[PDB]
Structures are given as structure tokens and as C-alpha cells.
Amino acid sequence: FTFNEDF
Amino acid sequence: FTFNEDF
Amino acid sequence: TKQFSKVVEDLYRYVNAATGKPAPMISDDVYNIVMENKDKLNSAIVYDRDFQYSYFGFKTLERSYLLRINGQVAERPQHLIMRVALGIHGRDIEAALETYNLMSLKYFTHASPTLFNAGTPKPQMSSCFLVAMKEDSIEGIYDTLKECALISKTAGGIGLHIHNIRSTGSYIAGTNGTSNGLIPMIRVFNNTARYVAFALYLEPWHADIFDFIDIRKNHGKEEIRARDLFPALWIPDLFMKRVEENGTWTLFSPTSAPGLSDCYGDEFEALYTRYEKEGRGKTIKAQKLWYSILEAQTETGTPFVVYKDACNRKSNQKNLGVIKSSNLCCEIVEYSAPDETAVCNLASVALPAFIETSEDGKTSTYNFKKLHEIAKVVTRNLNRVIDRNYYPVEEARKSNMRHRPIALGVQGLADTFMLLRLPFDSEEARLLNIQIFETIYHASMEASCELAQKDGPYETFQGSPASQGILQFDMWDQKPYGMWDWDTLRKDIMKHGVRNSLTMAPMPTASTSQILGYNECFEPVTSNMYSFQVVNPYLLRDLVDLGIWDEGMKQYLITQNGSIQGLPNVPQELKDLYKTVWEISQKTIINMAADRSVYIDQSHSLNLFLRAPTMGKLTSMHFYGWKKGLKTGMYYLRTQ
Amino acid sequence: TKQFSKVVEDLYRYVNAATGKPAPMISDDVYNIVMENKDKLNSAIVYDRDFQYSYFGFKTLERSYLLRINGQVAERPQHLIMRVALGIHGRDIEAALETYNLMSLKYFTHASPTLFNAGTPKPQMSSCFLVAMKEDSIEGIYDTLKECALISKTAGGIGLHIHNIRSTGSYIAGTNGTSNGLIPMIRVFNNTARYVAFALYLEPWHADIFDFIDIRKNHGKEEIRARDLFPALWIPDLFMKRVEENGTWTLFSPTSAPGLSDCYGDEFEALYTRYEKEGRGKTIKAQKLWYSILEAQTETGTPFVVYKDACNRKSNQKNLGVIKSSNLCCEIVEYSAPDETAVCNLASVALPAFIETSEDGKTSTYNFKKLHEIAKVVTRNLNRVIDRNYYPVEEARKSNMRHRPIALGVQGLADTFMLLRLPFDSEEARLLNIQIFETIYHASMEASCELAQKDGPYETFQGSPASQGILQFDMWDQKPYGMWDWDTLRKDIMKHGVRNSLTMAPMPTASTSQILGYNECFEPVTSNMYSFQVVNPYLLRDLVDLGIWDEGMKQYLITQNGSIQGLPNVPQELKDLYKTVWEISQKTIINMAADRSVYIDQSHSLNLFLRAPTMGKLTSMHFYGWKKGLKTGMYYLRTQ
Numbered sequence A, B: 001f002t003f004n005e006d007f
Numbered sequence C, D: 001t002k003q004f005s006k007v008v009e010d011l012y013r014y015v016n017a018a019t020g021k022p023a024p025m026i027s028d029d030v031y032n033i034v035m036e037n038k039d040k041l042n043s044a045i046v047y048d049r050d051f052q053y054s055y056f057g058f059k060t061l062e063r064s065y066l067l068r069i070n071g072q073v074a075e076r077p078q079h080l081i082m083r084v085a086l087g088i089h090g091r092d093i094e095a096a097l098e099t100y101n102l103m104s105l106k107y108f109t110h111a112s113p114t115l116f117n118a119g120t121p122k123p124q125m126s127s128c129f130l131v132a133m134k135e136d137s138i139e140g141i142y143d144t145l146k147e148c149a150l151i152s153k154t155a156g157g158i159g160l161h162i163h164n165i166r167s168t169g170s171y172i173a174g175t176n177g178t179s180n181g182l183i184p185m186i187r188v189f190n191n192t193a194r195y196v197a198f199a200l201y202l203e204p205w206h207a208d209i210f211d212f213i214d215i216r217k218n219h220g221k222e223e224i225r226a227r228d229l230f231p232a233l234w235i236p237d238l239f240m241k242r243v244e245e246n247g248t249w250t251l252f253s254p255t256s257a258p259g260l261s262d263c264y265g266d267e268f269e270a271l272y273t274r275y276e277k278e279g280r281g282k283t284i285k286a287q288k289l290w291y292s293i294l295e296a297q298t299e300t301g302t303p304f305v306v307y308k309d310a311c312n313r314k315s316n317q318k319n320l321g322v323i324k325s326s327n328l329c330c331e332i333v334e335y336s337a338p339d340e341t342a343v344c345n346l347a348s349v350a351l352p353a354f355i356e357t358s359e360d361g362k363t364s365t366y367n368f369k370k371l372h373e374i375a376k377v378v379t380r381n382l383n384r385v386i387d388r389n390y391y392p393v394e395e396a397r398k399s400n401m402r403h404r405p406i407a408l409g410v411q412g413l414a415d416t417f418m419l420l421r422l423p424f425d426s427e428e429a430r431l432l433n434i435q436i437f438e439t440i441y442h443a444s445m446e447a448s449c450e451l452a453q454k455d456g457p458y459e460t461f462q463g464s465p466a467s468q469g470i471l472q473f474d475m476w477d478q479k480p481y482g483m484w485d486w487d488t489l490r491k492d493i494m495k496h497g498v499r500n501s502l503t504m505a506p507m508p509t510a511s512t513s514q515i516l517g518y519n520e521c522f523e524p525v526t527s528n529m530y531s532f533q534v535v536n537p538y539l540l541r542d543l544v545d546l547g548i549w550d551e552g553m554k555q556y557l558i559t560q561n562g563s564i565q566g567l568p569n570v571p572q573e574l575k576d577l578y579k580t581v582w583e584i585s586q587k588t589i590i591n592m593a594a595d596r597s598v599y600i601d602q603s604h605s606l607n608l609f610l611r612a613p614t615m616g617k618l619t620s621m622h623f624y625g626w627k628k629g630l631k632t633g634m635y636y637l638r639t640q
């Protein structure tokens, strides 16, 4: 799981 | 309706 | 373990290993009793009586009745029986020991909940409850719901009457909305039953009646059904009249026509009639509803039919107020109110235990004196149960303590007739039926009078029919068959009272008759073949005494509905004697039910069986029971 | 009728013709007030203000808000408003008349239930209730159920927390059986909701959590669903940590790990941690549950996400005990207990009513002084509502009277930004957002302090953060933006108290924003086209001022999601200004929510919008709000 992204 | 029969 | 006191030790010290909580299987009370009397108790048990059962009868105890440790049976049958005996009698060791012997020898037994729960820490020994809907409000509905939820934590059936809830479309103050009526509210109780059986009682003048009687229909019109609960009709005589004479019937919301369920007979007729003329409801043809009833019964076996006026006019509890339902199985006729939930205190006498073969030859007789005696013992047991019982709700404690009603039943009637070589439909079966129910009524009322002398009459005795010398058969305007001295009994009752408001209610015995190896209650045999492979043992012996039993018989008897009519190597006396219930006229069944009913305090569960059902046969079968003065016109319709 | 006092006459004397019951639409109280003041009241009304609405806005009042006689509208909008004004203020005619003017001019409004019910005989003016599950027992569950049924007779939402009900398989004393867990019990409440919305609150360490979060899944695995109710997670920080660091999470039954929902922050962490080491529960990978959460949200929009520790650490109601849920819409953060059911007392300030175009040209300014003023009026209204409200259950009366919490909200934020020509995502929109919420907080707390001087502080004021000078932004460790004098306010508060435990909770405005013709609450526009056929009026005027609007535009704007990016005859300043909510970074949405939240007493309903959703975007969007210190991480996930 990826915490730190473009949303 | 029929009241008085062979049952 | 072969030692009662030791299995009591184990059951009492049981600890739930998964959780570390001590989980005692025996009450402090009953444990202290066993220990202080361990030698007398332990050496009273006759372990030889464990083999005095059948295979499927022992397996019923093993599968569901005998207490278990780590899913392993911890009680032998004699232990269970001695536990029940002590659970009932407590400190009265000699009473306990008698019940032990009489139960172990199989003269009588107690209802399932007694057998499960007697002598345990929450000893809920009663079969069922009759709940009043508390009030036509969210408050009342949800208080009633809570109570039914509380009752279902320790199980046993519920009969609930809802004549007072306003029907679909009815006005509600402070809202644009109208009531959803009964069905939606029934679905709330259904769901609670599922979360934590239910019988529902309604008078046929209620405006949601058409939907109510189809509660169990298969074809699922979505959220208008509720399969799980049983509808039962609470039928006023006026209804049956109107159907017979082909006139009209008016549907009311109890808020537009209040009080209908709070009167009966002529006072109902007057009040119903006035409401009809004030145009308070919706008129239809009586026979339209009638038609819909019989369609529902033909298809589902329900609704049950219990005659309101017969129940109330012929109840010794009539000084209490108006009785508004029966119970799950249609034998209990006991008063209920928002604060009084009627309780069923049940036990069955084993009728075949009294057959005696005396002075050589084929001659067997029936010991009515020993029957009278055992019925006296059970009456006393049942009174002990009132007092030592754990009540799940206060309404139920208040009811039982105040009026102390009892319900003695029977099992093995058919067995009795067959062992004595009497066809169910014979003049001799008809007389024995009358005599048995007479002695059981006489004995229970005699024992109850003895009790009233010791401890006083029940609180509501004064002003009751029994206190004015009116006994049950009197209310049927009959003279008792007269095997027992009624004059002397009636005299003692008026002088001393009885301890019990009510005494008799032959019920469905079900699993307590499977254990003792007898046919259900007062019914005939549904088949001469049950389940595996077991033929009627009385039939089986007769076919072996003609040497005709083999495999070219077991096939036949299977693929033939367990019937023996139309077997060529079989004597006529046998055919007569082993008629299936499909083969006995239902007129004879209703006649015999009418005979015993003069001796029945409450009612009895009359299952009816129609081979080739038509709307005309069913109508006739209903009106026949109704003109016979039956309280319970019909429990289930079994068919096909 | 064109006369307020006359329509009050008609509504008061209304009789239900079908039944003959007098069915008054007005309270005795408010009727006596109208009559004793009929001239002042009647001539205060400006009927010209009925045309100060829109078509779809007037039709919302007409369809559902204005009182009706025989299904015929009986109130004009000015009558409804004057009724609400009097319903709120009673005898305080000058307060009533002010509310009349300010509401009729559209500076603010009141929540739906106020508009329906103000000045009627059962004046239930509050939006929602936060119910505690009373106890882990049939008794407690059925007492709670009754209460929820009572609350639903007069409607308004329910937030219910169930952290204390033991999970599937849990042991029950006196029975062979184990608990069914939560889902079956949820189905009981669902059914009651159907019979008479519901949000359900749970901590993610509860052993039935996986089933709980799928409550709304489409693929119907029979009786394990309950579509009707909304699941909301009450998430402890430890949960989010464990997910982030990819470690373990332990599932407990509250009976094997008691007290978890009665502490928060470090005390929770310590107690949770000790329970995990005592092997009291079942360990899995934190990310397994996380994964299941986001699947449920992606598919159903639920469960909602509200951060337990943020809510409790930053609540002025922390002296009461631990707050165990929010409400239906995820803005209320108020304490509840078995005997205290928290109430939502809601009203919204219309933000665009304060835009002023002053000293010629294109220059419009924002009147913060008039905003401060109107927020003061609404705060006082809301206090009047606490006292004059009809409480459906006693738990709710006890809660509201004891802590007096209030919830001021807003509507037309997006409208405000667009009229002032500010892109939602601009530095100027970011500053105006901060300033508005600062003035509304300052004004509500100032008015509430005034009230405390008149009538005393609320009963639980002492020992509260506010009484120690700790105001909301202090608990976020920030300095207030400083348009208003906080030193003087804080000084007066510590000296005099406040009348209200809480003041702010920007909510879903929904149908009260449709009437005034503004966009829902603090959200941007979901489309520049709603419904028929209505384009964003601010957009519409700009396309008409470029002369490009026609039918070769109405088509486009329809089959294009109401978006204007990628239209060639459209200036860049317009595209920036009319971004759809799908077109605004959700990072900007969360940043702006974090800005205003330092001024929010309670929480606010943060709907989130993901265009091309992935498990990674959603995870990031969650952790972003969580590290921002948000109380409500997410109301609904809207998608696609």
C-alpha cells in the first residue's frame, strides 16, 4: 500500500 | 357453500 | 460415572474452559439437597430401568435431553429423572423419590422444558406463555416486543394476541401518516423471534384479517408475509352464524369499534351489531372471508381455529375478565392482560401404563384406580413447578402465582386402544375415552382440593364457577359419566376451594412421547410405519403371529402410507384395529373430542386430517366441531 | 388568505373530516401569541418577499414545507417564516420580528425539522440524535430499540454506537449458545427503522468489523447485509499507524477486552497494547482490514471515516467523558451515554448575503461585521430552540438541557467565491474561508457568553477547556487569524462562561439550500448544470455576456458533466472560476477543511470526490486528512 500520492 | 356433508 | 451424586458433582463444578468462567449445571439449592441426602438418593436409583426404553427413544434423550460436559453425555437417564424429581420437589425427599419411581417406570412424564431445566440454576420449567399486546402505541408494541425477547432467551412458545392494534390506513394523531397495520408489526416480532415458536391470535372482524390469514402462504408477495409465525383465529359465534346463513360481516379497526375483544357471547353480538349500524367499518359477504380462510388452511394448514365464546363461556377463569387467546398448540385457555402473562405448566400421563392382564387368558383390563392415583401425583408435581419455577418476565410470575393454573395431559391413547384390541371408532374406545378423562379430571380436582386445604385456595378462587359448584361438565350442561363420586368432590371444593384455577389441557406430547415409545397424545396412528424402518410394534407382532411378516411386507407397508386395509392375508379384526388417522372418520375424531371435553378445564389440540380435501368437507368439518361446542375447532389441518 | 392571523386561525381549528377529530396545526402557546399581537404581526409581513425565491426553490417549500389543509397549501412562505420565528421566540415579539426579517431577506435559515415543526403542537425542531447502546444485554438492546422507535415517530436522524455489543461466537451465561454478534442485531434496528436514516458507529478493533463495513454491499449474501443503515468508522490513531507501518491489528470482543471505547489517545494505546499481549483477541495484518475498508467505500461510498482521537482530544465536551460517535451526517461531536442522547440543533448562515459592491466599478467586498451580527442572531435562536423544543425521549432532554450544544453551519460558500470571482483553489478563496469561519466562531462564542451572563453558564461549564481559556484553535496549537479580538472574548468567557458547550458544525444543508437557491454548505459545485434544464446562473450570465450561450451549448454542457474546461470560446479566468468538484484537487479541499476546522467546535461533513479512483489515491487521501488532524476524514466517497 502507497501512502503519499497525487490526488 | 355447503354445511352438512360426509367427512 | 455410575453414581448420581458424582455426576451432580461434575455438573455443578463445570467450568467453561474456553473462557475460564465457572458454569454450574446444577442449582445451589438442588446440589445442597443431593449432598445432604447422597446415600438415600444414590441407592434409590434402579439403573436397570435405563434399558426400559427403545432405541429411537433413548437416542432422543441422548441427542437432546441428557446434560453434557465437553459435548459428552454426562447423565444417564436415571440421573436426568432423579434430577427432575429433585428439581420439582426440593427438600421433600419422599415426594422426590416417588416421582423418581413413577417417572422411571414410565407412568407419566413432564414437558420438555422441565426435563431440560429442572434442578439447574435458571429452572424455566414451563412450556409456553400467553402474551397480551400491551397497548395500541409504539410504547406498548415495543414494551411487548422486549417482553417477547426476554421470554425467548429461555425459550418455550408464545401465543400473542393483537386484536387491539389499529389496522392499515388508521389515523395517527400529530401526523400526515396513517398506520401500516398488522403485517408490518408482525414482521417486527418475526425478526425478534429470529434474532433471539410464535402463535398469533386474532378476531376475524379485524380489518387486516385477509392479510393476517395468509401469513404463511408460499407465493411470496414480498414484505406482506411472515413465515415463521403461526396465525390462529379467535372466532366469535356471530362469525360462524353469518357464514352459515350467508349474510354479511363487518371489518373494523379497534379504534373505530373499541371493546370487541373485551366481551363475548350476547354482549359481543349487541356491541358488534350496534357498531355495524353506526357504519363504523366495512361490510362484505361473510362467506368471502370464510372462503379465504379455507384456502389458507388447505394450502398452509393454518390459521388455527379456536372458538372465543366456547372458551370464555366454559372457562373457570371467567371471573378474571375475558380470555383473548390460546397458546402456540391450542390447548391453553388462560387469561392474560398487559401485566399478566399466562403460563403453561405441562405434564403427560402415560395411558398404557395402566393396562393390566388379570385372571388368565386374553383378558386385559384398565386400572382406573391407579390412573386416579398417578394423576393426583402429577397434579402435585405441577403445583410444585408453579412455585419453584424461574420466570423470565414479571408478567408471567404475577399470572402463575395469582391463579395457579395447571395443565395435565395424556399420551398413548391410540396405544391404549390397540393393546386392549379396541378400534378407535368402536363403542368400547368411545367409553374408555370418557372414563379416562373423567378419572383424570376427578383426580386432579381432588388433589387440588387437598392442596387448597393445606395452603389455601388460589387468590382468585372466590367468585369463580368452581366456587359456586359449577364444574367443567356442568358448563357443557351434562351429567358426568359417574365412575367417580362428583357430589362429594363438589361439596369439598365449595367448602375448601381448589389450589388450581385450571387443571387439564391435553397437549402435543411430541418428543416426550418419543422417549417413552408412545403415539402423540390423544391422536390415532398417522402410519403403521415410522421412519431406517420401524413398523407399529402392536401391528408387527400380529403379522408375526400369522407368520406373514418378511420383506414382501416391509416394501408394501412402506409404499402404501403405512396402511393395512387392502392386504389379503390380514383378518378384518386387524384392519379395524390399525386404521391410520386418514382412515378414521373425522366425525368420530370430533365426537370423541367432544366427549372428553366435558372433563377438560382448558382445551385440547385437535389436529384434523383430510384425505381428499374440498371446500365443502372442510366447511362441514368446521361447523360440526363448532356445533359440538368445541373450544379448539382445529389445530393443524393435515392434508393430501 | 393574505392574512397571517387568519391562516393561523384555519391551521389551529383544523379538523380531520375523515375521523371527526380536531387536528390543530398550531400550538396553543403560539396561537395565543399571534392573536394577542395580530396587528403588529400581520403588518410586519412583507409579501413582496415571496417572489425573492427561484422556481425550484419555491417548489421545494410548496411540495414539502408549507403547511397544508385538505392537501391544499395553506401557508404562503412569509407565513411559514413568521410561524418559525414565533415558534423559536414565543413571547419575545421583537426577537421574532427580527428573525422574520433576517430569514425572509435570506441571511440565514433553520434546519428542515425547525421549518416543519416550529410553532406546531409537537415542536420537534432538532435534526438528529446520537444514541448510546445502553448495555450488552437483551434488556439493553431492546431498551435502545424502543428509544430509537420513539425517536423515529417524529423523525430526524440517528447516529448509534455499538462498540459494546459482544461479537459472533461470544459466550453467553446459562446457555449452550454463543452470540450471533452485530449483524443480526443490526437487522433488528433496520427492521424497526422500516416499521416506524440510521448511522452506525464502530471502532475498527471490533471482531465483527469485516461484516460491519460491508453492510451496504450490493451482492446480497442473504441475511448478512442491512441496506438502509449507514456504517461509520470510529477510528483510533493506533489503527492508522499500524496500517501505515504495515504491522498488525487485533480484533476483540468488548467482553474479552473491555473499556476500549471508554478511553482515547495514549490511554487507549496502552490498554489496547496490554490486551494484545494477553492474547485476548485475534491478530491479523492491519492492511488486510484497511484493504477491505477501501473496497467497501469504492463500491458503496461507506463506511464514513471519523477520527476518534481527534474528536475527543479537541472537544470542549471532554470533561463529560469519552465521545463514542458522531451523527448521521458526520458533523456532530457530542457526548452520549445510556441516559443522555445528544441532540443536533442546526441552522445555516447564508454566506452570499454579505457580499457588497461598494464605491463603483467591478469591486465587491465581503461584510464581515454583518456576518458577525447575523451569526449572533442565529446563536440566540438556537438557544431558544434548546428550551422550546419537544423532546421525543427523556435521554435527549437531559442531554440538551445539561450541556446546551449548538450547531451553526453555512451555505453558499462556493456561491460566495464565484460571485467574488475567486477560484475555489485560489489564495483569495483560502483567506476568505479562514476569515468567515473565524468571524462565525468569534460571533457565536461572543453571543453565547452574553447569554451566560444573562442566564448562567451551562451546567457542565466548569472543568471544561473553554473555562481554562482553551478555545478550539488553541487545541489545534494555532494562533487565530486575528480579524477579531480573541483576548477580550477569552477573558469574558473565563469570567462569565458560555451558555453553550459547543457552537459550530457545518452540516449538509440539502433542502434548506435548495429553497434559498445556494450550493450545498461548504462544497464546490458538482456540476455547472443541475436538473428540466438549469445551468449555473453565475456561469450562465458570463456566457450571455460573451454572447455564446444558445442551444449549441446547452447540449454540450449537458453531455459533458456540466464542465467548461475544454470549451474553446471560453476565457481562462472562467475555467478557473467554474471548476467542478471533480476538477478541484482533493488536497485543496482537505487543506481548506483543515483551515476552517481550527474554528469548528464539532466537525464538518467532508464529502470527497475521486475521478479515477485507485486503492492508492484513496489511501493517500485518507492519510492526508488524518495527518491534517481532521475529525471527519470523510463523509461520503463519491466516485467515477
Ligand SMILES: Cc1cn([C@H]2C[C@H](O)[C@@H](COP(=O)(O)OP(=O)(O)OP(=O)(O)O)O2)c(=O)[nH]c1=O
Pocket: C136, C137, C138, C139, C141, C165, C166, C171, C172, C173, C174, C178, C179, C180, C181, D153, D195, D196
Ligand atoms: C408512529 C407510528 C405508529 N404506528 C402505529 C402504531 C400503533 O398501532 C398506532 C399508534 O401509535 P402511537 O405511538 O400511539 O401514536 P400516537 O401517540 O400519536 O397515538 P394517536 O394516533 O392516538 O395520537 O400507530 C405505525 O404503524 N407507524 C408509525 O410510524
Ligand SMILES: Cc1cn([C@H]2C[C@H](O)[C@@H](COP(=O)(O)OP(=O)(O)OP(=O)(O)O)O2)c(=O)[nH]c1=O
Pocket: C153, C195, C196, D136, D137, D138, D139, D141, D165, D166, D171, D172, D173, D174, D178, D179, D180, D181
Ligand atoms: C439471549 C441472547 C443474547 N444474545 C446476545 C445479546 C447480547 O449482546 C449478549 C448478552 O445477552 P444477555 O441478555 O446479557 O445474556 P445474559 O444475561 O445471560 O448475559 P451473560 O452471558 O453475560 O450472562 O448476547 C444473542 O445474540 N442471542 C440471544 O439469543
Ligand SMILES: [Mg+2]
Pocket: C136, C137
Ligand atoms: Mg397513542
Ligand SMILES: [Mg+2]
Pocket: D136, D137
Ligand atoms: Mg448479561
